[PDB]
Amino acid sequence: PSPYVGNLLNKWHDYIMQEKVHESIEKRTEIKQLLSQAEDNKDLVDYFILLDHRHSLCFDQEASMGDVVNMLSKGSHDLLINFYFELFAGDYEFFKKNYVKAISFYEKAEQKLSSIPNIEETKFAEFHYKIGVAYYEIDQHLVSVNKVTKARDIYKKSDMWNLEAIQCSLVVGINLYDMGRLDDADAYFRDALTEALDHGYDKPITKIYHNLGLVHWQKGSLELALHYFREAYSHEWLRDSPKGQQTVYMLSRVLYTMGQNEEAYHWYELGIEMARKFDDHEYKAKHDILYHLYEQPSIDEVKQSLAFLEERNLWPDVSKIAKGISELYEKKGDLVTSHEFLKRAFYAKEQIQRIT
Amino acid sequence: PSPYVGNLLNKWHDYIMQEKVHESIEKRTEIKQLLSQAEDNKDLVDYFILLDHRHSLCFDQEASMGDVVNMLSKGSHDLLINFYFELFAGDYEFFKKNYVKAISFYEKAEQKLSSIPNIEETKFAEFHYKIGVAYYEIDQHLVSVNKVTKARDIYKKSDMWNLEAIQCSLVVGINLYDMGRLDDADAYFRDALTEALDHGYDKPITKIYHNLGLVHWQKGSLELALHYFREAYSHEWLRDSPKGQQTVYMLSRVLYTMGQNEEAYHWYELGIEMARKFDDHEYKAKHDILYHLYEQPSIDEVKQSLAFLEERNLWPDVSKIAKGISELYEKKGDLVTSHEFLKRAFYAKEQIQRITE
Amino acid sequence: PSPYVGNLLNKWHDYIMQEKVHESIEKRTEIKQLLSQAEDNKDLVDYFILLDHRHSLCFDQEASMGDVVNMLSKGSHDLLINFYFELFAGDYEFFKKNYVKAISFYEKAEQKLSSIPNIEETKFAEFHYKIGVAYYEIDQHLVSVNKVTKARDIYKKSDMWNLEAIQCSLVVGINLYDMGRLDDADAYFRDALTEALDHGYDKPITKIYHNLGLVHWQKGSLELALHYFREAYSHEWLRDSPKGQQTVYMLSRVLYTMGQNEEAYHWYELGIEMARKFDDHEYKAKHDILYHLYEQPSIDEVKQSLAFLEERNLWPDVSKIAKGISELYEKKGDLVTSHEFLKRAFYAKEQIQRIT
Amino acid sequence: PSPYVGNLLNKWHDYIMQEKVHESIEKRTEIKQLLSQAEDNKDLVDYFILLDHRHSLCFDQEASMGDVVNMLSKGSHDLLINFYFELFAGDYEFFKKNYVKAISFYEKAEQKLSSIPNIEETKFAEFHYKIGVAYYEIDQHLVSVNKVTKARDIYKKSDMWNLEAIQCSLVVGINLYDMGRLDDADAYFRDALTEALDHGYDKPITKIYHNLGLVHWQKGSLELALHYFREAYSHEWLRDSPKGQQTVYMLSRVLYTMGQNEEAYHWYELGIEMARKFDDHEYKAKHDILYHLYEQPSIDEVKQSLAFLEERNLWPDVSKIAKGISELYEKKGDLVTSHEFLKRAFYAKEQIQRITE
């Protein structure tokens, strides 16, 4: 249910406000088509109606059907419309990677939740989660754990929202890992895994196994980390989704670190070939560094690809890759360029606090 | 036909509740037709929309192939619909003269008014006024003054809604007059008059002058009472309102109570003729009593017309009319039949406390 | 629990507001004494405390115990104090016979009932009744029935307030009688009577029987009316209460109307003797008219006593007594003075609408 | 000793809940004694009264022989007491450095703030500020800026509470500096300075100048950084505050980073001597690293003092100090030990994300 239609409905709201018949008929016709699918978002349809009705009051031929200066129901329509405008603007800003603006809009919409009459317990969890995830994108991990736990506690009660609870504990686990509290993250991931198995869910499982792989990778038990990355690739057909690119990369990277090189190059091959398929320039850079480090060394070529990743922000990945390089160039006895990369790995850490 | 459509919209709400497509499309079409008359009511149009949408969701389902399983907006639409249903049921009961039922419905709708957003101060004054006038209809004057003052105080603050404030002080004054507190009624009436003159208004003026005329009539200064009734007739072209009958009648009755029988008959003539134009049997009865008292006396004929007014539950005017007769027939030396009418004027007073709906 | 202490507490509130230590210590000492009884009014004690505490904040030696400019709790203390001030002012104005002012204060206090946190269902019935009874004093019978029915419906629910429900239906019945709907008033009175008998209550019974007597008196069945007035005198020792004066009067008046005269004079005697006992000048006037009508006629003497009652307002009683006289002076053939009294009975009716 | 009394009052509330006369009279006397210090806290006194009354009703019963069976005022007193209990529990947890628990309690008390009458806009800003600073304590800078801006916007409206607004912009700036957004921190700091100068205020000025000094220090323009640290020392008599230690340290460190070793040692001297006056082992460690770096080098001695700072969970300053060392030891040609410290400065960075309570 793409968050474009939300922005479309928001634009339409702006067009009714500027009293512009012709582009208002345009926006409502694009929108009217898109939501004709079988079952796509209660909140969209409601916002459509609430805009269509106020569209009429400004554009349809009232001259025989009264004078709607400002009726009693405007107060309550205003409240819903302002709320829907802010919920969907939040969703769209989150879509554009503009997380600070997204939180701003969500928090305004969260406020209006009290004045709406029959608000359900779950519309509060929705905002708890959306805010909590947006905070996770900007490395505010403690508040993220705080808000999505609040959502999880609601989703635990009712037994219809069991897929959401799994996603919530998945998000707490990721926060706990990004911090470094690895055994707590492990626990959350394992609790999501068994809850996902008891039910028929398959969607989250893949992410769960990949995170478990990351936990034990950072834990240093690479044998067990490798196991989980394999299981992530096994479960769900990811080879032609864009989102399964990361598992192929991790598989290659661990096998190169354990000195497995033979298999590691085969996952490199598959990952280069996927970087073709989706034209993902970043995963091409990341697999480039693997190749020009373990296959055909070239310190200058690694800097080239590293430079590209630094131009893309992506500073967690830069920090950890550059640290890896410096650690490696130390067992190879070269202090001079190991220091060069540690300086780059350190600068990357400082780039994570800024979050511009 | 304002609160008829309200009852129509209420019935339509009742048909959606019973999940009945066929009579819902019927009433929604008469109303859709009926609401095309240019006639200022925001709340009717609003209630139509709020019902049209709930009509669609139960019978049409939008023609877009949505889901519409109790959306976020259902909660608040429910609340508005429940409110409109009771406001218009109140208006309709007020229409059928069932004032106790009307207050009951208004007070229920007044409650739900608190739990609604962006409400103007005046939507509360409206219920203060409606309840206050319904109480006036059942001779509960002290509470009516209390409630319509509450409305007046809000309408005074805005200073944009002062045409309503004038009507409020008009209603307080009328209550005070029906009680007998004549100088207090005078004060309210004169204060509404100067407020109506300071701003650009002619609509209320005529009623204002007619009440001032009534006050000083009951005060006994008939010269000044006659003055005000003249001004009421002058200030609007009343020869074609149905409601301007009351000024013509008082003019005749005042001039007959004074010794100006010649002019008094001229207004009698006009008032009989107005009783023709409209199907007003009351003012024919009241003008009948005038004629069979001052022109060609006939105690039996007066009894007939008075009897008709008593059959109409018009117990205030009967009380006052019968008292007048008794007072007159005493300076005419006839105690016997003066006592007959004082007994009837007294019985009428007891009929004013006793009122049933 | 006299409504003087309420006015006392209100005066004290006024003295703290004018920052007047010395008369504040005076008022709180009179009050502190009076409420030392075993069990006298929750609301009084609460208002005392709430004033004593704000008394301290203006008068006690804070100089070492902080600077109470305006703390957080002032908002909520203000609300309770303003409420108690208006409840007890209402009670006191009702005490002074100033019913319009009393309703004004009650209705302001009724409004504040929503903002207080744990308000019980019965504090609303209390105001419904108090307002409803105040309206009854000023002949606004339809609204009185409306409000005290609202109170009665609350008192019906819980089974601890069964004495109040009896009083409520007693008040509806009186309204219905003052209007003239005699069979409905009869029904309410009979329903209060059986409810009072099922329980051990004796306080209302006497008033119930006297009202039932009035109903059937106005109904014209004087035999049965006389029965109830007797039963009113029988139940409860009223001969030395001021409030039992009215039953002795009714007993005498009915027996004089039925031509019983022998017994009627004996109740006249007792009623004159009670008018001595309490110096009730009105019941002396009312019994005077009985005597100078049925015992030693004197049209001039009746006018004298009637004049006194008209100087006391009491216009219901004047209207009905004067009407009685005129009716009687008609079977005696004297139209001249019967008309004199009907004029006076009619004027009295007009005095009931004014209520100045 | 402000939030100690809060915990004392909370314990007293706990003793009334367990219906325990003997320890209730004890704590209520220490608090009654302790609150005689002239020290601005409305809310403490208020909480005492609200507890003293509930103490009486459970143990004294007023000494007037009342009834006091849950009166009308009990409902609202309950609500205030529950609120004060959680506000002061929050303050006490903040006192013990347990910031996550403190936010938990503040957020609970923030909820009950909505259901209370006559509330000022600022009592909401207070919780915005307290929560915002607690989040700053656990390096959650983006939410801290978000919450303390919310406080600032209320404190700006009043225009009576602008000394608080200055403190709010001080806190936003510090967050922005801890992040690295130096020009945005600069802007907030300069805007607080002009607001502090336009009105009559000296209290914040010193901290304002010290942060501006820090910004441009991290910006690398040491000449102007040195200027601001001088002004911080000048603007208040800091020779007797414990908190003015930080300006003396920066002055020395800046002058040592520049080539002004002579003056730098004079501020080192003063800073060692201040580390004596107070039991501040941190600033002795930090000044120790300065001395064993620029005066009498000893890489092993620096490791000792740095180690002490790492044992204190002071991971920001260790990150910056270790980075400084590594940078310096490279122009000194020694890559080997420069790498040793960059590894430690990097480890310190990872220690800043990981924080446990």
Residue numbers in the entry:
A (entry chain B), C (entry chain B): 9 to 364
B (entry chain A), D (entry chain A): 9 to 365
The publication says:
It lacks the conserved residues essential for phosphatase activity and has been shown to regulate the conjugation process. RappLS20 activates conjugation by acting as an antirepressor of RcopLS20 (22), which induces the formation of a DNA loop by binding to two closely located recognition sequences near the Pc, thereby inhibiting expression of the conjugation genes and plasmid transfer. The presence of the Phr*pLS20 peptide antagonizes the antirepressive action of RappLS20, reverting the system to its default state.
The apo structure shows that RappLS20 is all α-helical, consisting of 17 antiparallel helices that are connected by short loops. The TPR topology is lost at the N-terminal end of helix H4, as helix H3 is located towards the inner lining and helix H2 towards the outer lining of the solenoid, an inversion with respect to helices H4 and H5. The loop between helices H3 and H4, indicated in red in Figure 1B, therefore marks the boundary between the NTD and the C-terminal TPR domain. The three helices of the NTD are approximately parallel and therefore do not form a HTH topology.
